[PDB]
Amino acid sequence: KAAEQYQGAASAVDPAHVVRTNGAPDMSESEFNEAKQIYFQRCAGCHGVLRKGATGKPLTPDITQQRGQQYLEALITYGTPLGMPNWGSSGELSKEQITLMAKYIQHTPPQPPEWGMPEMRESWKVLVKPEDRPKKQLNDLDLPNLFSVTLRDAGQIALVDGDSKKIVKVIDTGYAVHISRMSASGRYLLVIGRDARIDMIDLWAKEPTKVAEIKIGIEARSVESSKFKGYEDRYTIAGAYWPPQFAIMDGETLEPKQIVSTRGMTVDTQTYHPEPRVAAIIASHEHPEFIVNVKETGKVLLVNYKDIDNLTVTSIGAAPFLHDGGWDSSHRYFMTAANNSNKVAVIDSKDRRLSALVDVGKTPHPGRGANFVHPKYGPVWSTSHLGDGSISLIGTDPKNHPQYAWKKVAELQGQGGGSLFIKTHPKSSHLYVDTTFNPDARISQSVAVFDLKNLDAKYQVLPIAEWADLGEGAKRVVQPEYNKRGDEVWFSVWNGKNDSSALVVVDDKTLKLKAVVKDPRLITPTGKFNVYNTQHDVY
Amino acid sequence: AAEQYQGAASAVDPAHVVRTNGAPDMSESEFNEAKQIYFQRCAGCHGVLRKGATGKPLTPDITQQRGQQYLEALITYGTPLGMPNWGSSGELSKEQITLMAKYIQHTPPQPPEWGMPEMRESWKVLVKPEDRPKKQLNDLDLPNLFSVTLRDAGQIALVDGDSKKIVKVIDTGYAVHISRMSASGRYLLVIGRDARIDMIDLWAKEPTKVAEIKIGIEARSVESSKFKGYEDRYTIAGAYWPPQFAIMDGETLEPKQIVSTRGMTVDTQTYHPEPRVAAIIASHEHPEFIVNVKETGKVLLVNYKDIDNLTVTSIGAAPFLHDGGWDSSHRYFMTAANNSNKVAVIDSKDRRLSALVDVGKTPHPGRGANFVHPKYGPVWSTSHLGDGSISLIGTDPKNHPQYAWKKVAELQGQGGGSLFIKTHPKSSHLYVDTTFNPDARISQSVAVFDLKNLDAKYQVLPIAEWADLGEGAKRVVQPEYNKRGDEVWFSVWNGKNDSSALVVVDDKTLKLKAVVKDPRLITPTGKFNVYNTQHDVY
Numbered sequence A: 001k002a003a004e005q006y007q008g009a010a011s012a013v014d015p016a017h018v019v020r021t022n023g024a025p026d027m028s029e030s031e032f033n034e035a036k037q038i039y040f041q042r043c044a045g046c047h048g049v050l051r052k053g054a055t056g057k058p059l060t061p062d063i064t065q066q067r068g069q070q071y072l073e074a075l076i077t078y079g080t081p082l083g084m085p086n087w088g089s090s091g092e093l094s095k096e097q098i099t100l101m102a103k104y105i106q107h108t109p110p111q112p113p114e115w116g117m118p119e120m121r122e123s124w125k126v127l128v129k130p131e132d133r134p135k136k137q138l139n140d141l142d143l144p145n146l147f148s149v150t151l152r153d154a155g156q157i158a159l160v161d162g163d164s165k166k167i168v169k170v171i172d173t174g175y176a177v178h179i180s181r182m183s184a185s186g187r188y189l190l191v192i193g194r195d196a197r198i199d200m201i202d203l204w205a206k207e208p209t210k211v212a213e214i215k216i217g218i219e220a221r222s223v224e225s226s227k228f229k230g231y232e233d234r235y236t237i238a239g240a241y242w243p244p245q246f247a248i249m250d251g252e253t254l255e256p257k258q259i260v261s262t263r264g265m266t267v268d269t270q271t272y273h274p275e276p277r278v279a280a281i282i283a284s285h286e287h288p289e290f291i292v293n294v295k296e297t298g299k300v301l302l303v304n305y306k307d308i309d310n311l312t313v314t315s316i317g318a319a320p321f322l323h324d325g326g327w328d329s330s331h332r333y334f335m336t337a338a339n340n341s342n343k344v345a346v347i348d349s350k351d352r353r354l355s356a357l358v359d360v361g362k363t364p365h366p367g368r369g370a371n372f373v374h375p376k377y378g379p380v381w382s383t384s385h386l387g388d389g390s391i392s393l394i395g396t397d398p399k400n401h402p403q404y405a406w407k408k409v410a411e412l413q414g415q416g417g418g419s420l421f422i423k424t425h426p427k428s429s430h431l432y433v434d435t436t437f438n439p440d441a442r443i444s445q446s447v448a449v450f451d452l453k454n455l456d457a458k459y460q461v462l463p464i465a466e467w468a469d470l471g472e473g474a475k476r477v478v479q480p481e482y483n484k485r486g487d488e489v490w491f492s493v494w495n496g497k498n499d500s501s502a503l504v505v506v507d508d509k510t511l512k513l514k515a516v517v518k519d520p521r522l523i524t525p526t527g528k529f530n531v532y533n534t535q536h537d538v539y
Numbered sequence B: 001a002a003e004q005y006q007g008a009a010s011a012v013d014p015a016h017v018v019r020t021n022g023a024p025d026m027s028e029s030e031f032n033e034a035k036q037i038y039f040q041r042c043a044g045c046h047g048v049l050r051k052g053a054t055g056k057p058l059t060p061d062i063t064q065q066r067g068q069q070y071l072e073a074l075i076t077y078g079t080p081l082g083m084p085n086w087g088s089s090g091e092l093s094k095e096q097i098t099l100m101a102k103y104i105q106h107t108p109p110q111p112p113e114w115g116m117p118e119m120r121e122s123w124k125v126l127v128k129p130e131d132r133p134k135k136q137l138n139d140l141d142l143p144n145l146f147s148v149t150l151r152d153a154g155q156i157a158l159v160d161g162d163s164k165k166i167v168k169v170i171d172t173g174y175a176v177h178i179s180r181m182s183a184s185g186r187y188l189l190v191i192g193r194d195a196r197i198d199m200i201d202l203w204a205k206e207p208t209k210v211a212e213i214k215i216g217i218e219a220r221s222v223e224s225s226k227f228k229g230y231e232d233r234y235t236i237a238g239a240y241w242p243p244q245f246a247i248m249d250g251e252t253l254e255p256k257q258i259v260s261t262r263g264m265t266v267d268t269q270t271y272h273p274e275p276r277v278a279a280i281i282a283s284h285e286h287p288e289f290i291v292n293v294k295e296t297g298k299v300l301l302v303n304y305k306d307i308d309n310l311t312v313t314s315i316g317a318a319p320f321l322h323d324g325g326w327d328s329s330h331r332y333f334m335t336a337a338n339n340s341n342k343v344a345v346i347d348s349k350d351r352r353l354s355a356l357v358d359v360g361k362t363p364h365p366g367r368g369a370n371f372v373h374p375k376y377g378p379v380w381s382t383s384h385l386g387d388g389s390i391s392l393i394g395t396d397p398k399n400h401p402q403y404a405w406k407k408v409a410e411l412q413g414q415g416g417g418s419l420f421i422k423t424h425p426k427s428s429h430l431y432v433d434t435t436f437n438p439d440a441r442i443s444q445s446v447a448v449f450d451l452k453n454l455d456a457k458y459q460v461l462p463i464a465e466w467a468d469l470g471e472g473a474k475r476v477v478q479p480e481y482n483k484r485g486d487e488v489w490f491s492v493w494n495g496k497n498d499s500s501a502l503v504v505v506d507d508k509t510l511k512l513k514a515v516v517k518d519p520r521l522i523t524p525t526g527k528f529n530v531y532n533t534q535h536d537v538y
């Protein structure tokens, strides 16, 4: 009773300013669920789970009811020239369905489940204990030259032998694996699905097999391993889109250790954002840390794992909509794209500060980028764009080239916009650029190639999907990727689930077709990661 | 192109994202009537999103499962585990309780956020630092001044220690919770439960406000940078709503950084949507602030060496962190995890949790009471709300390792409902109030222990009776010494329409020394002696 009177006073919060949400149009269960289904299949991607993920005004009740039924239907029907597609004019959705979506977004956002340690541990499984694993490589595969390829819609990945061009093993994983990363020892391949399901694969087993698995959220895209001297296979980190968090697990067993929320204040307006999805994650070579990208808030977190019981995080402000990125040639500066802000943030991992924000083209999408030495400007890091056909070259040598450091030193012009990946290798005098989402089929099915030794000459167009000899289907070409020795570049001919796909290999020295990988198992091939190049960040 | 890039389906399954409702319909006046009772009577314990109390949360999933009648009965009779009885006591009507039962079955109404735009809008520089005096422009004994909170008046009074007179009364935020001093000893910082901060220059002809800002909707703590070379550099404040804390310029109060405390709990490691910020103490070992985050049980070490790239070290402790203070050496932060009945020891130098000491029922130390025990060496003590015990915890790892972080001994007071324990380097007494004890005579008096003879029972000083105030609850609260340590002040916290007073005792003789009355002295609660607060003398 004493403690009850102690905490008995009135809250300083005024009841009058605490608002009940409603005033939305009536819709039955059948109706609400149908809309909700359409929302996560078609809208959530850009707008997010809580509808504050896209640029412009959020789709929350305060705003939507202000706009009204008519405006919403009209907006959803025709779209806008700023990234919002037209669902009615295209014939994607029916007027009946648009009427439902307009009603739906006027309601409070249905809540998805949280996912903490109890859920994580429940999902955690150690298939083969560290003790029961081989002490040395039990097969005679050339592991460094192996290619972990994603068989997207199949919810699997295929290990492809570099030299033989044959599929060695097919493994079941989470749905639509987004990326593959390698442990610092080069022994374990880590894969994570969009469903946030991670799988640890042992390349030393007689036949490469899964030794651990866990689910770190409802939705995810990134996973990474400790790469600081003396931390080989110590920790594994993964970022989720929902819930807004990242989890640190044991590098050997995938046992969940810490889960950290990314919900917080934005860099630009410094207001609270309830859903800051975790984008790229890269491991620091200068300090025992993980460099995490937090999209909507535009923050780059340096999570120190030297002591994970008492986690130390340094929050660096960058720019809103942080997505992909990669290291500069020296592996000290994290060159990351803030695509909707049309900028590239430079994070110094040694000094641990934002070195600069470079202005670039419309919607920069560098992937991990492409590093090379410019004859005139010295070391540069480059990126292509989704918003245009330009390629930005940024100087990355502060020490010996201060005149060009962090400057969009020069540009190149590819086939057009819709570009996803740019690429090159130390031993190569070529630069590859795809155009996966370019609305012109001929362009989307081919890749441009520049001559690093004559940057003034126009690119050469390589007909990848055509060299595939596949037949009907979109046949979208995506992500150029070199082999261990960098004498050949691989491309994925991303065709439909019921269509035929392939992996095309070009002779880097001659720019001629060298091979074409086909297999009934190769369904919707997307990302490809050569074991050596991914592990040693060779790009 | 970008529309096809971001055009695939979300990995989130539509079938698992849930629409909330199935709640008892209620009109606007019914919902508002209930909502007003919730924030007047319930929010304190349960919180804004109803997950602040122990036991099950009052969210729709649990409430609708329990149902209408279960809820009404629970609200009507309460429970022996801290939930008051509203019907049995006759506080709420059967009609209102029914409204409350239906109300908690609905989604919790949302209070607004409070970011940088809102913060700057409230920010005001009343007197620019360049226009402020360069020397003390008055004859006041600043070190021995007491900053007294006149709770319901939304003001504070600066009382002269020796003269016992009200030197100045200042308008502030409502019900100021605490007063803190800057390291230079020039500025006094006060923050109201309404999250409104006020900076006061004691060097002006008449001590006056030079700056003000609002850092949330509800708050309790504020603090200034005390690391060497950082005198008056930054000012931090923690809020209850939103769940955040803010760092500002320590000269102008200009908002600089805002950090959300929403996160994962230390125990269950699950997501908590409302981890309120409790105590905050400035480190002397490193340039960092030590923040207590309640519901998640985390102690954050926020480094201000580079405010642009904020570094924060998260130390897990135990759930329900509240008040705390330094050990005699000013190196270990002794803080109470009140509902967990534990005191967490945070090593500010090595930056780690040194221990979790089991204590009595609901410990409430305030900043605590340090002193050297004849047998056990230097200890830190704390009283309780749940019982009449007083825990003495060893705080010397160097010379008394056998006693370090151990509940070395115990003392017994008049009973539970205690809030503060006090002593001083120059004093040989130990005072403990019992403010919320259900017995009028007990709540109106304090206990005093002889530190030179701890085996002996305590003496009871009749503080309220010495005040000669007449009717009213006359709750005595928080002992506080003067700069010399020979006087101990107490507040006689009566109603706003009643008469209150400040009683002063001669520490050397335990005899009444003075009584401070004044028509302006409305509902006096916290009292902060400038020197003692500034140099953490307790």
Ligand code: DHE
Pocket (backbone or CB within 6 Å): A045, A152, A176, A177, A178, A179, A221, A222, A223, A278, A279, A280, A281, A282, A323, A324, A325, A367, A368, A478, A479, A526, A527, A528, B005, B006, B007, B008, B009
């Ligand atoms: C955050 C993020 C990264 C960087 C992770 C890292 O390196 O740590 C990344 C990288 C990648 C990489 C990494 C390549 C590399 O070289 O590192 C690939 C191949 C890839 C295949 C695709 N990505 Fe990706 N991608 C997203 C998110 C991301 N993708 C999306 O949210 C988006 C826009 C929408 C979606 O549907 O998920 C999206 C669409 C795509 C595709 O359309 C691709 C081609 C096929 C697919 O499965 O969706 N993304």
Ligand code: DHE
Pocket (backbone or CB within 6 Å): A006, A007, A008, A009, A010, B044, B151, B175, B176, B177, B178, B220, B221, B222, B277, B278, B279, B280, B322, B323, B324, B366, B367, B477, B478, B525, B526, B527
């Ligand atoms: C977080 C917190 C601190 C530590 C701050 C710091 O050290 O930086 C504190 C300290 C304090 C201190 C500091 C004393 C000290 O000597 O350090 C005082 C005087 C004080 C007066 C009161 N507090 Fe306090 N107090 C709360 C919160 C807190 N109180 C509550 O939430 C609670 C339980 C409920 C409420 O109504 O706010 C509460 C009730 C009270 C009271 O009932 C008091 C006596 C009168 C009032 O104004 O409500 N609290």
Ligand code: HEC
Pocket (backbone or CB within 6 Å): A038, A039, A042, A043, A044, A045, A046, A047, A054, A055, A056, A057, A058, A059, A063, A064, A067, A072, A075, A076, A080, A081, A082, A083, A084, A085, A087, A101, A105, B002, B003, B004, B006, B007
């Ligand atoms: C990304 C590829 C998108 C998808 C898929 C959908 N929307 Fe969108 N939407 C997107 C952007 C970038 C914007 C801003 C447009 C602008 O000109 O500012 C929008 C905007 C809307 C709006 C209007 C918001 C307002 O101003 O009040 C609505 C109502 C809207 N989007 C609805 C919506 C629905 C219902 C969608 C799926 C069926 C959907 N969007 C998909 C980006 C994208």
Ligand code: HEC
Pocket (backbone or CB within 6 Å): A003, A004, A005, A007, A008, B037, B038, B041, B042, B043, B044, B045, B046, B053, B054, B055, B056, B057, B058, B062, B063, B066, B071, B074, B075, B079, B080, B081, B082, B083, B084, B086, B100, B104
């Ligand atoms: C702290 C001083 C409290 C105040 C004021 C109010 N409640 Fe509370 N309540 C409190 C605790 C510690 C608990 C747990 C009690 C237990 O023995 O488990 C509760 C519990 C409830 C519940 C029941 C939760 C459940 O089991 O489903 C309800 C419905 C409840 N409290 C309602 C409620 C209302 C409506 C209040 C204000 C009018 C209120 N509580 C105040 C602590 C405190």
